[PDB]
Each structure stands twice: as C-alpha cells, then as structure tokens.
Amino acid sequence: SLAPLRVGILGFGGLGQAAARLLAPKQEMKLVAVADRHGYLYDADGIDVDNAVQAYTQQGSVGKAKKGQMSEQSIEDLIGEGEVDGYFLALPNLPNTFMADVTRQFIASGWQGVLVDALARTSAVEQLITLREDLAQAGITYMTGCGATPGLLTAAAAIASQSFQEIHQVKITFGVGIANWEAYRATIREDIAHMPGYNVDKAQAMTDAEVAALLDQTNGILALEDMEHADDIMLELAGICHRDQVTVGGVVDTRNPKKPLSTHVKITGRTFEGKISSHTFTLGDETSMAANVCGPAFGYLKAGYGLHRQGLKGLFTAADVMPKFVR
Amino acid sequence: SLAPLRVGILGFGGLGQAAARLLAPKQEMKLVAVADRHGYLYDADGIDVDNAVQAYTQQGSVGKAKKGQMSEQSIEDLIGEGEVDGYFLALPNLPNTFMADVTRQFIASGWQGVLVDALARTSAVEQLITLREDLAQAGITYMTGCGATPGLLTAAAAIASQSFQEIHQVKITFGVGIANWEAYRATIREDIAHMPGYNVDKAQAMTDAEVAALLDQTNGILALEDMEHADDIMLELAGICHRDQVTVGGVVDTRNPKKPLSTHVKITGRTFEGKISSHTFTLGDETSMAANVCGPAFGYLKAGYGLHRQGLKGLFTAADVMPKFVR
Numbered sequence: 178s179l180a181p182l183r184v185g186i187l188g189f190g191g192l193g194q195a196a197a198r199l200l201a202p203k204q205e206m207k208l209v210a211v212a213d214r215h216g217y218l219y220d221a222d223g224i225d226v227d228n229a230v231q232a233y234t235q236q237g238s239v240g241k242a243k244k245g246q247m248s249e250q251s252i253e254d255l256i257g258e259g260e261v262d263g264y265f266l267a268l269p270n271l272p273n274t275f276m277a278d279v280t281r282q283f284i285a286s287g288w289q290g291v292l293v294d295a296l297a298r299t300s301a302v303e304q305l306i307t308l309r310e311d312l313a314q315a316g317i318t319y320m321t322g323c324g325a326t327p328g329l330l331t332a333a334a335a336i337a338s339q340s341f342q343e344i345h346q347v348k349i350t351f352g353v354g355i356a357n358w359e360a361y362r363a364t365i366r367e368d369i370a371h372m373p374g375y376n377v378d379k380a381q382a383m384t385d386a387e388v389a390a391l392l393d394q395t396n397g398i399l400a401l402e403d404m405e406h407a408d409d410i411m412l413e414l415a416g417i418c419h420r421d422q423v424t425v426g427g428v429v430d431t432r433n434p435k436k437p438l439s440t441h442v443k444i445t446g447r448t449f450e451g452k453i454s455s456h457t458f459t460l461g462d463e464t465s466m467a468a469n470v471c472g473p474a475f476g477y478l479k480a481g482y483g484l485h486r487q488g489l490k491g492l493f494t495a496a497d498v499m500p501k502f503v504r
Numbered sequence: 505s506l507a508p509l510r511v512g513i514l515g516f517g518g519l520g521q522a523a524a525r526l527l528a529p530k531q532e533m534k535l536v537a538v539a540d541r542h543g544y545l546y547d548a549d550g551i552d553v554d555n556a557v558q559a560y561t562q563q564g565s566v567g568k569a570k571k572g573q574m575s576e577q578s579i580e581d582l583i584g585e586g587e588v589d590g591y592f593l594a595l596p597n598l599p600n601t602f603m604a605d606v607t608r609q610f611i612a613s614g615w616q617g618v619l620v621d622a623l624a625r626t627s628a629v630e631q632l633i634t635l636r637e638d639l640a641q642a643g644i645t646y647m648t649g650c651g652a653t654p655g656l657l658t659a660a661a662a663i664a665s666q667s668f669q670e671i672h673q674v675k676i677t678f679g680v681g682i683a684n685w686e687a688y689r690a691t692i693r694e695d696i697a698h699m700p701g702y703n704v705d706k707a708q709a710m711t712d713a714e715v716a717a718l719l720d721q722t723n724g725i726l727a728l729e730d731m732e733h734a735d736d737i738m739l740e741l742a743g744i745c746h747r748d749q750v751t752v753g754g755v756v757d758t759r760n761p762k763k764p765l766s767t768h769v770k771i772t773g774r775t776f777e778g779k780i781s782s783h784t785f786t787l788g789d790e791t792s793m794a795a796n797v798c799g800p801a802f803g804y805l806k807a808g809y810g811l812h813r814q815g816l817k818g819l820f821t822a823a824d825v826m827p828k829f830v831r
C-alpha cells in the first residue's frame with residue numbers, strides 16, 4: 178500500500194475487463210496499463226476502469242478513453258512508455274503462435290519484470306517452453322497456465338498429489354456459465370477448435386453467424402472431452418505424472434450465467450501402503466470463470482514478483498509455485 | 505538417483521515408522537538416519553526399514569538394531585555423526601515446548617540443512633516463530649505444519665483462496681480411522697488435551713488404562729470441534745485470512761482402520777463480482793493419516809531443499825510454498 182505493484186493487462190475482452198474490475202479494490206496492486214488490438218491506456222495513478230470499459234465497448238478501443246492513445250502496435254508502444262512491474266496477457270492464442278510472438282516482443286524490448294498468461298493449449302505452452310532460456314536471459318519471470326485450467330486446478334492437483342507414491346490420473350471436469358458467447362469470443366473460438374470436426378485455422382475463419390448456428394444445434398451447450406490442455410505438460414514438468422495421465426473435459430453453457438456442472442479436479446494415485454484412492458477439489462458454483470481465472474493470475478503475478486525479487490528468472494507454471502493472496 | 509537427498513526421521517512411532525516405509529521405494533530420497541527416545545540408527549547406504557521396526561517394536565529402540573547405538577541423547581548424538589541433508593521431526597509436542605527445544609538443539613549444533621515438522625498446535629508453531637531469525641542465521645530452512653492439517657489441507661486452502669477478493673472461513677473437517685489408538689499414542693494424547701475437560705499437562709499424566717476408559721465411553725470415537733490448530737496462524741502468516749476465520753474439527757475412530765468421515769476443507773469467500781461461494785477439497789477415504797501426513801512432509805522437505813539451495817533460510821509454512829512431488 179506504500180509500495181504497490183504497478184501492473185498491466187494486454188487484451189480487454191471478457192478476461193481483460195474482468196481482470197481490471199478485480200484489481201480495482203486491491204491496495205498491493207495498481208492497474209496502470211491496458212492495451213487492446215487498436216490502442217492503449219496508461220495512467221500511473223490507476224486506470225478509471227469504468228471509463229476504459231466505456232471507451233472500449235462503444236468506441237472499440239481503450240485508446241478512445243480520457244487518457245487513451247490509438248496504435249496498431251499498442252503493446253509494442255505501451256511497453257516502452259509504461260513503468261510497469263508485471264503484465265497479465267489476457268489475449269487470444271489465435272494463431273496458436275500469437276502468445277509466443279508477444280513474448281518475443283517483450284524479450285526484444287529489453288524490459289525486465291513479471292509476465293502472467295492464462296494459456297490453455299499444450300502446444301501454445303510448448304512454444305513458450307521454446308523461449309525459457311531467452312526469458313531467463315532477458316531478466317523476465319514468466320508465469321504460464323496461471324488461470325483456472327490450466328492454473329488453479331493444476332496447482333490443486335500438484336498439492337493433492339503429495340499423498341501418493343504414484344499418480345494414476347488427474348481428471349479435470351470444468352463447467353462454465355456465460356449469459357452470451359460474445360462475452361469471451363476467443364475463449365469460445367479456441368473451444369470450437371478443440372471439437373471433433375474443427376481446428377485452430379477453421380475456428381479463426383468462422384463468422385459470428387456460423388458460431389451461433391453451431392451453438393444453436395445444442396441450445397448453446399459445448400460438451401468438450403479430452404481437450405489438448407496444458408495442465409498435462411505442466412504436471413509432467415513438475416514431475417507429478419506423464420501428460421497422458423492428465424485429461425481435461427467440460428461443458429460451456431453460452432446462454433446461461435449459471436454453471437451447468439460443478440467444476441472439479443479428481444487426483445487418483447496409489448499411496449505407499451499400496452491403496453488406490455482419489456482426492457477431489459471442487460469449485461463453488463458461484464465462483465465465475467473470470468474469478469477462477471483472474472484471481473489465480475494475479476496471485477501468480479505476485480508470487481512471480483517474489484521470485485523476480487530474489488533474482489529468479491525464466492518459465493514457471495502454476496504447478497511449480499504457491500501463488501500469494503493479493504490484498 | 506545419481507545425487508539423492510539423505511534424510512533422517514526423529515521419532516519412530518506411527519508417523520516415524522510410516523515415514524520410513526514411505527521413503528523405502530524413493531530414488532530421489534534415502535533414509536540414512538532414525539532416532540527414538542533411547543537410541544539411534546545411521547547407515548549412509550539406507551536403513552533396512554524391516555530391521556529398524558523389528559528392533560523398535562520388540563527391543564523398544566532402533567539403537568537395538570543391526571547398526572543401532574543406545575543413547576539418552578539420541579538426537580544430539582545422531583546430529584554430530586550423521587551426514588544428513590534434511591530431517592522429518594516425527595515427535596510428540598509433549599510438553600507444548602518440546603519441538604522448539606529440539607529445534608534449539610539443531611540451532612546450537614551448527615548443522616546446516618532442511619527441517620520439516622507435522623506440528624499441530626497454533627501455540628507450538630508460535631514457539632517455532634520465536635526462533636525464525638535464529639533459524640535463518642544458523643542456515644536452516646525449516647518447513648513447519650507440513651502434514652495433513654496443518655499441511656496438505658492448509659496448502660489446498662491457500663490455493664483455493666485465489667478465486668476470492670476476501671476470505672470468510674476455512675473450515676477443516678478431518679476423519680481418522682486407526683485399528684487401535686496405541687499406533688499413534690502422542691497423536692491421541694494431543695487430541696485428548698484439545699477436549700473440553702482436559703489440557704496438555706493432564707493428557708501427559710494420564711495412564712494407558714485411563715485413555716482406554718475415556719475412549720470406551722464413546723466406543724473409541726473422539727469428536728473434536730474448534731481445536732487449537734496452527735492452520736489458523738499459517739493462513740494469517742500467508743495473509744489469506746485472520747486465524748479466527750480458520751476452524752478445525754474432526755472425528756477419530758480408534759477401533760476402525762476405516763475413516764469415519766471424508767476429510768475435507770471448505771474455503772468460503774466473496775469474489776470481485778460480490779458473489780459468495782465455497783471451494784471444497786476432499787481426500788479419498790483410502791488415503792490414510794500416515795499417507796496424508798508423511799507424503800506432504802517429504803514433498804515439503806524437497807521444496808525446502810529447493811529453497812535452501814538458492815540460499816533461502818528461516819521459517820516457512822505449508823501455506824507459503826508449493827511442495828515438490830518426491831520420486
């Protein structure tokens with residue numbers, strides 16, 4: 178509260194906006210920086226969040242806000258100008274290489290500090306693994322898969338694993354309730370890509386009408402099984418189990434602000450007594466996706482600052498570190 | 505497996521013996537050292553666990569084993585002789601000052617490395633807090649409350665808290681099934697002290713007959729509510745909630761190797777959207793107390809080594825650190 182972390186959000190959609198509302202009441206963390214595709218907003222006194230959302234929703238960028246600046250290289254521009262201790266990357270991974278590219282920008286920028294993502298795909302995370310040395314060398318502490326899943330649920334699994342001699346499966350079943358699907362376009366596009374008939378490239382090309390059409394077949398309900406989720410590699414990287422033992426599935430109701438099922442992770446293992454058993458970590462039906470994603474993200478930004486401060490640089494997952502409650 | 509942690513166990517009761525069985529199949533960790541009240545056993549090739557248990561059970565000390573040495577200052581002696589990277593303190597906290605005293609021994613010993621306890625009482629932990637600077641200065645990384653509760657459940661709570669703006673309660677309800685109460689004498693004596701009619705001093709003085717008599721009133725079933733559990737201060741120390749928001753209760757069936765209820769922690773908070781909700785982390789009914797205690801203990805020894813290695817010394821709780829799966 179005397180020396181507060183100055184933090185930025187890149188991307189101002191469902192997650193970016195929700196991140197900004199979540200940081201509003203904090204005293205240890207101050208939102209100084211937001212960027213979207215076409216513009217950015219910096220204010221070392223703290224972002225008027227209501228104004229940044231008004232600007233974004235009605236004029237299509239935060240660059241159109243009281244303090245905003247338009248730019249077709251918003252993040253590139255914001256990096257040089259902004260005195261910022263850590264950024265949350267609330268961005269799409271469209272294409273599957275985009276997060277890595279922005280991270281490359283940050284590496285080349287010379288900039289030092291903490292980065293956090295809520296990256297979902299094993300493949301997207303592997304691209305970030307590509308950069309783990311570069312990351313260390315540029316003096317960046319990078320916290321990857323630090324949302325809900327990956328993130329909170331992965332970390333719960335890493336903690337639960339401690340009871341066992343060998344891990345057998347980590348099963349994630351998530352439920353999401355959103356009032357309409359446009360609230361989290363990329364989240365829902367990235368979901369449709371996981372589906373049987375589809376991929377990343379197809380999902381990207383699809384029109385808002387084609388998405389509503391698909392959704393309409395099932396009354397707004399995406400059932401997703403064995404999705405390509407980075408929970409798998411993070412748990413492997415922590416040496417808890419092989420990625421093949423990690424399985425991620427769920428149900429998105431896109432016409433319903435209420436969760437269609439209780440999000441839970443089941444951790445199955447054999448104890449040193451040769452008994453086989455399962456721990457269950459279940460989320461409260463009234464913890465929203467945004468809460469379950471952005472809450473851990475900033476806890477991981479803080480833990481990441483902890484690590485940065487004792488000169489720890491490189492790539493950490495939600496599985497590797499205890500996030501620190503942000504006040 | 506090339507460079508394995510050499511670890512010791514102080515105390516060879518229910519937990520100490522179970523610790524030794526748990527470390528048997530590990531390749532990253534080698535049991536080199538065990539101490540009980542009257543003797544100790546060192547063997548830098550690894551303890552024959554079956555022999556140490558035979559010696560203890562039938563001749564009353566591990567000092568009576570193939571390699572053993574009798575001593576009425578077993579731990580004092582074992583410290584000087586033993587090349588050991590980390591110790592698990594499987595000891596009673598009778599009297600409520602005993603853990604602190606042994607820790608003082610370790611401080612005065614000059615010895616460097618990692619210590620772990622499964623300490624249960626807020627008061628016992630406060631005594632260890634007394635020593636946090638001494639601990640740092642002697643070059644010891646000390647992991648306190650790193651069993652089941654405190655420990656695993658506390659850590660699960662710290663992770664679950666991340667979804668929330670404010671924490672309202674952490675409620676722990678534990679179930680324990682043991683075939684007879686003498687398996688974990690001090691555990692059960694420490695329990696009876698928490699009870700309404702009793703205290704530490706009374707519990708200590710009580711005879712094995714007086715304990716069986718008490719237990720016999722309720723057919724071997726201790727119901728315990730609002731116990732003085734260090735979960736409370738650890739969560740406060742991690743700045744997640746005030747100790748008064750943390751509440752620990754449970755049921756020990758002392759005539760039943762099956763859990764009388766499913767151990768769980770409920771974490772209640774308000775999200776940034778002003779919604780109030782609860783996460784639940786439940787343990788599998790076939791994870792034993794020993795598994796749920798010793799598994800996290802050694803995960804925390806390893807994490808503690810991690811911290812020691814980057815020159816981090818002092819007092820950490822299960823709430824402050826991600827334990828590392830031991831292989």
Ligand SMILES: NC(=O)c1ccc[n+]([C@@H]2O[C@H](COP(=O)([O-])OP(=O)(O)OC[C@H]3O[C@@H](n4cnc5c(N)ncnc54)[C@H](O)[C@@H]3O)[C@@H](O)[C@H]2O)c1
Nearest residue numbers: 188189190191192213214270295324325326361362363364
């Ligand atoms: N880990 C988890 O638990 C978790 C959960 C949900 C979503 N996610 C992921 O989080 C990401 C964000 O999803 P969302 O629903 O907030 O997305 P969204 O489509 O609602 O918003 C994307 C935002 O990115 C902005 N942006 C900023 N700079 C950009 C640039 N240079 N190019 C393109 N867009 C730019 C856009 O303007 C837009 O505001 C997705 O990839 C999603 O899969 C992770």
Ligand SMILES: NC(=O)c1ccc[n+]([C@@H]2O[C@H](COP(=O)([O-])OP(=O)(O)OC[C@H]3O[C@@H](n4cnc5c(N)ncnc54)[C@H](O)[C@@H]3O)[C@@H](O)[C@H]2O)c1
Nearest residue numbers: 515516517518519540541597622651652653688689690691
């Ligand atoms: N954190 C948790 O989840 C958790 C759970 C269960 C028990 N515990 C705690 O763990 C502790 C161990 O309980 P237990 O059931 O293994 O105890 P126990 O009574 O079965 O064994 C105690 C052992 O301490 C040994 N010991 C070694 N050196 C000693 C010395 N100098 N003085 C006295 N005894 C000495 C005794 O010889 C004996 O082997 C208790 O304090 C208990 O409350 C914690």
Ligand SMILES: C[C@@H](N)[C@H](CCCCCC(=O)O)CC(=O)O
Nearest residue numbers: 297325351352364440465466469
């Ligand atoms: C966007 C959804 N399809 C997933 C939701 C994970 C968060 C939900 C957990 C909860 O709040 O219960 C996350 C993802 O897919 O990356």
Ligand SMILES: C[C@@H](N)[C@H](CCCCCC(=O)O)CC(=O)O
Nearest residue numbers: 624652678679691767792793796
């Ligand atoms: C000994 C008992 N009275 C408690 C049991 C905590 C571990 C049980 C959790 C479980 O395995 O379900 C621990 C304690 O009291 O310190």
